[PDB]
Design a protein that fits this description.
homotrimer; mainly alpha; 11 helices; binds chloride ion; identical protein binding (chains A, B, C); ion channel (chains A, B, C)
Chain lengths: ~220, ~220, ~220
């Protein structure tokens, strides 16, 4: 029991948050036109990176009536994400991008990102429960957007880049992390209702291992291995 | 006077809310691609039904700075709307859809829906007045979105379905219920300013009768009768 | 020092606000289809004028979790903007439009509008500082949207008019007032951090003179002079 309690209480800042930022900004760099956008519109590229890094907090704040940029009061967290964005886009002489994009190192940051994703899902359900004790649909919605993040607002992340693809969206066709966050927010909600006979730390540990194995396998298979 | 006081104080839950949900989900089913969407993207179809059922509360909460999903704390109300959505889309062996879509029965639910629409317009003006005693434009805006509902956000209801028709919107070209809600929110605001020499229950009664006669006639004429 | 204190404390209502409304509605009238929109959809034209007049307050309220229409409790301010919208669009027999659009008179209102823009940038940083003492990114974001105004939501101002041009936006390609508001909100934030060794009234005075000279020159040069 001590292993599940220690695994579910590790400080995510700054190492696990940096891994979350690295993977998110790497995905941004591989989007069509992102490199050219960072040179012609550097501010819009930075703002796009902030959406990838903190979109889950923006979305949760929007759903609960809090300031959508409330999370940007975390100065050192925003500065850390900005440094990741700068090193990946404007530092060819720096070994940072080549190291973090190296697949063995990249798979470690993918696993650490899943640790942050599961913690954010649980915190969303817990925070929504604090405001609505028996509001099950509010808990599920809050935990879902904390896990999915920028994927649910992808239509407007594209709009910021000058792209408009209204034929599809993350709700009409869910990817794996969005669908997995939906199953995850239901399990964490049922754990709050005491109908799920599982401890909270055991669910955080087991669901994180499920997300780590799936994401590491998908990232390695997507790289043809 | 007792008839207007009893008509304007009938509990809308659950019968009048169910009639509101039935008519709203029926309109959703007749939209292009809705049946295919409910089979390929059942969650997006459900979320689209929630926008049709509770869009007026989402919009009013957005205008006043409240949580946009605050109304989803009403568990039994959300569950009731979900049951209407399920019976209309995934129950061909159940006599529910054929009965509620039968035109004589459908016209009764259309009339009951207008009872709910007028009550929501008045409650929007009253609630906005409680926060802004002499904020006339806030009262009118709040009562308008409580009456119009999902129509004012139709461009983004279409976006959820993969449709984008930016050439028109409900503000640029108002339909009858949106235009009637605009006239209704002005009358209820003037009744709050005491410049309109009419009782509050008399205005609820008379304006509901106006909406019932118009909506029943339009629904029957639209069916070629 | 008394000149900078008197220049930065002049009541903007109603004269300086009227100049802000006149220039904003004039820009609206010169947009493609605006005159035809005011005749076929007068309410949508009015709502579009309100976005041009009060979009900076709507955007700031959205960023900080306040009611997006909170500024519409200022009745006399909304009525004043409505009168400017009515005189410019529906009064050909009235000398108002021809006088305010006359270039020498128009350049005076352009200068007075810049006085209001700088005051709104400073008030945005000050108000965000009141809620977040050391939230630098929240102060900069709040002051930026107070200065840029409707430009940052131009994609949805176009959507209200039935126009959709997703290839560009005000963030991907900043115009001068949006870019100048970004530099302005940084200077006013640094003045709040006490790292900028300049008085608050001296920064308001000098930055307003910079915006007046730039905007008057651009408006006169754009008219080929
Ligand atoms: Cl900090
Ligand atoms: Cl590469
Ligand atoms: Cl309940
Ligand atoms: Cl049928
Ligand atoms: Cl007033
Ligand atoms: Cl002219």
């Amino acid at each position: 029991g001590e292993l599940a309690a220690a695994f579910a209480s590790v400080p995510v800042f700054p190492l696990f948050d940096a891994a979350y930022f690295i993977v998110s900004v790497l995905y941004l760099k591989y989007e069509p036109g992102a490199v050219e956008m960072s040179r012609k519109s550097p501010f819009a590229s930075w703002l796009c990176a902030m959406l990838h890094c903190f979109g889950s907090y923006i979305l949760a704040d929007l759903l609960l009536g809090e300031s959508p940029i409330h999370y940007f009061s975390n100065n050192s967290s925003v500065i850390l994400a900005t440094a990741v964005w700068y090193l990946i886009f404007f530092c060819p002489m720096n070994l940072f991008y080549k190291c973090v994009s190296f697949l063995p190192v990249k798979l470690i940051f993918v696993a650490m990102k899943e640790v942050v994703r599961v913690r954010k899902i649980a915190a969303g359900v817990h925070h929504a429960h604090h405001q609505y004790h028996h509001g099950w649909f509010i808990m599920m919605a809050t935990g879902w957007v904390k896990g999915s993040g920028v994927a649910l607002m992808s239509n407007f992340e594209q709009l910021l880049r000058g792209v408009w693809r209204p034929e599809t969206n993350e709700i009409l066709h869910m990817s794996f992390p969005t669908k997995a966050s939906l199953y995850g927010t239901v399990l964490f909600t049922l754990q709050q209702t005491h109908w799920l006979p599982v401890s909270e730390a055991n669910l955080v540990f087991f669901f994180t291992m499920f997300m780590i194995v799936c994401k590491v396998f998908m990232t390695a298979t997507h790289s043809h291995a």
